[PDB]
Write a protein that binds this ligand. Structure first.
Ligand SMILES: [Ca+2]
Length: 454
């Protein structure tokens, strides 16, 4: 313990958050005693068991694009920082969550070119305010096929399964082999179709804004790492030419973040490590330089108290993800010496901001004056279809990273504020990797055997 915060406790809780998002029939390894079985008929409108996975955010839709992004990110965290997970006693918990979500993706893949990408209707799900276990509305399931395709979600799902096949191989080699086979199939599905025309049920929520070429590289990278089949490296490298551009230009867009929609920056980082090529160093360093000291004379906005601030919706999600990339690249022997220090320092600053360096934690159930009214149906647990009843949440959503402050560091803590005070799978994903690095560096002991029991 050498750092400003208890990073082990923070890591432990940030992993635990995913328990609270669990959908379906809860297995005996679940630690908490306040979530119960939910959404048990998921899939039955299409003759399948599609139970499992995670509810996305403060809602109960299963949106497989951010869900699969999260899956990949959690495996990437283990792939980079396994020894931090082992030392903190957190490996078994993150592997449990990685197995959980990827088991749901396997369920969603019932024929080679049939992939279910959503369970729940956004409008019906969001119109009701109550806990998961007592939902009564219809929860339709949605699929892409060869004639009605979804390359972006399929490819991101391939990535998740390929990454899981690596990190779960020691514990469950049989399941790992199953994941890899589904990953390879889903990748072929994404490649043969090259289209999102059938990916419609997430519209207004998780549209594919950047297109699927970033996912085609990212999934091929993971599949190369899982297989050592050089064809996947060829494809990953190839698809770089179609990565998202600054509009009107031929320059890859470095001014956003690695996120559920756009995974090119993480793909670049891993391609720099795999191949050593300058092309990829140039990509990832433009991005990381823009976030830190500047690139070609422009830098991201910073709040007065030191948050790198991309957007008002999920600012902490973006900063904390970029923190994880900064750590992974600065840990690499190929990073320029000086940028190592700049990038690590940046990552520290952003995690410490999340954890409370500005005077207040943004992590539910952690630190000083954390959020107490996150925009989350199940944590709140209304019996009256009302955000105001009860006045206080009946359950603590330990570990949940909220959306974050305004550009002036301000924040309130309102149940109704889904911009600054929602919580989500993708918000915690890169955060968990970054917290593992901080624990590696600075320690802080997890609460021993901590379980969220009421
Ligand atoms: Ca994309």
């Amino acid at each position: 313990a050498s750092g400003s915060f208890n990073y082990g406790e923070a890591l432990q809780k940030a992993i635990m958050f995913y328990e609270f998002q669990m959908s379906g029939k809860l297995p005996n390894w679940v630690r908490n005693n306040w979530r119960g079985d939910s959404a048990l008929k998921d899939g039955q409108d299409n003759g399948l068991d599609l139970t499992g996975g995670w509810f996305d955010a403060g809602d109960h839709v299963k949106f497989n694009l951010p869900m699969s992004y999260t899956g990949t990110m959690l495996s990437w965290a283990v792939y980079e920082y396994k020894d931090a997970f082992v030392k903190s006693g957190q490996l078994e918990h993150i592997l449990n969550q990685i197995e959980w979500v990827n088991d749901y993706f396997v369920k969603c893949h019932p024929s080679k070119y049939v992939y279910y990408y959503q369970v729940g209707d956004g409008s019906k799900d969001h119109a009701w305010w109550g806990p998961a276990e007592v939902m009564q509305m219809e929860r339709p399931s949605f699929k892409v096929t060869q004639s009605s395709p979804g390359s972006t979600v399929v490819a991101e799902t391939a990535a998740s399964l390929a990454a899981a096949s690596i990190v779960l191989k020691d514990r469950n080699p049989t399941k790992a082999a199953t994941y890899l086979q589904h990953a390879k199939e889903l990748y072929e599905f994404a490649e043969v179709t090259k289209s999102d025309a059938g990916y419609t049920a997430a519209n207004g929520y998780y549209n594919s804004w950047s297109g699927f070429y970033d996912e085609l590289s990212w999934a091929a990278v993971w599949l190369y790492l899982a297989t050592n089949d050089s064809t996947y490296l060829t494809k990953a490298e190839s698809y770089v030419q179609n990565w998202p551009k600054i509009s009107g230009s031929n320059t890859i867009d470095y001014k956003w973040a690695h996120c559920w929609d756009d995974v090119h920056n993480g793909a670049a980082l891993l391609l720099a490590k795999i191949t050593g090529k300058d092309i990829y160093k140039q990509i990832i360093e433009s991005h990381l330089d823009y976030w830190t000291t500047g690139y070609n004379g422009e830098r991201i906005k910073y709040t007065p108290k030191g948050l790198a601030w991309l957007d008002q919706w999920g600012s902490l999600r973006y900063a904390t993800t970029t923190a994880f990339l900064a750590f992974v690249y600065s840990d690499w022997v190929g990073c320029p010496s000086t940028k190592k220090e700049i990038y690590r320092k940046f990552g520290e600053s952003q995690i410490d901001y999340a954890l409370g360096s500005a005077g207040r934690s943004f992590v539910v159930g952690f630190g000083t004056n954390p959020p107490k009214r996150p925009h989350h149906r199940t944590a709140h647990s209304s019996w009256a279809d009302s955000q105001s009843i009860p006045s206080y949440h009946r359950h603590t959503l330990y570990g949940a990273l909220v959306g974050g402050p305004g550009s002036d560091d301000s924040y309130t803590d309102d149940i109704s504020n889904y911009v600054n005070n929602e919580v989500a799978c993708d918000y915690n994903a890169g955060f968990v990797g970054a917290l593992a690095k901080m624990y590696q560096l600075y320690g802080g002991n997890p609460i021993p055997d901590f379980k969220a029991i009421e």
